[PDB]
């Protein structure tokens, strides 16, 4: 003869609390580009051109 409860029984504490978040994010590494370190870079031409002689 238990009285019917108003609220459905459940685990009280939600999981959003009792959590710890580390400070920052981690980004994917990808590869390295070292074409400039070998032969350098020379800005000689112009955009909207076709050939160099």
């Amino acid at each position: 003869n238990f009285t019917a409860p108003v609220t459905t029984p459940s685990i009280p504490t939600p999981i959003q609390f009792l959590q710890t978040w580390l400070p920052g994010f981690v980004k994917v590494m990808t590869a390295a580009r070292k074409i400039d370190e070998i032969i350098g870079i020379d800005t000689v031409g112009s955009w909207e051109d076709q050939e160099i002689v």
Binding site: I15, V26, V28, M29, T30, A31
Partner: protein, 211 residues
Amino acid sequence: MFQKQVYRQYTPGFPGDLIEDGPKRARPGRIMSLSAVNPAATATGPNRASRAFGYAGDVSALGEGQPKTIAARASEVVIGGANFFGVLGHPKHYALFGSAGDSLAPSYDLPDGAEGEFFDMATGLVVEIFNGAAAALDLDYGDLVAYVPNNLATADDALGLPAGALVGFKTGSMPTGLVQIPNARIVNAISLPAQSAGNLVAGVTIVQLTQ
């Protein structure tokens, strides 16, 4: 699961994201649960992104008395569908909503009653593609696509397929029970391995031209 290998370049994109800019059409909608379908659904699946949806009904009445108030234009959709209502996309719009086992888990699923964006016309759309006939298939640039209905017969569904998965096929041959999306092209070549029941290969991400 953290980066266990370093590659020379990044991936082109993720499913459900627009990859090219051009003419585009999209409409909002609300999701119906499969249980509400009257003749029952032979094919079942979750409300996963990058999958076709079908029109269900109009819910713009918003009232019960003699004078009703039509304050908005709304439509509601089902995952399988037979009346095409675009493809769900733009994952950045929604929220995780949690998972059954635990929250903060990766998933493209969406709960019933949620609101999404379905694309009818798109210049470039990355989607997850499937394969039929349980045989190795090469798509190439210009094949067509179709999606699984809700009422697909179990005879035509020997390979366990989701409710609204997208399947590519050659012009000559198409699986017996499917609905073809009109004026859609593969655009990006792809190769898929052989399949088996219960061990379907998920396929690879692929660009799409919906209309």
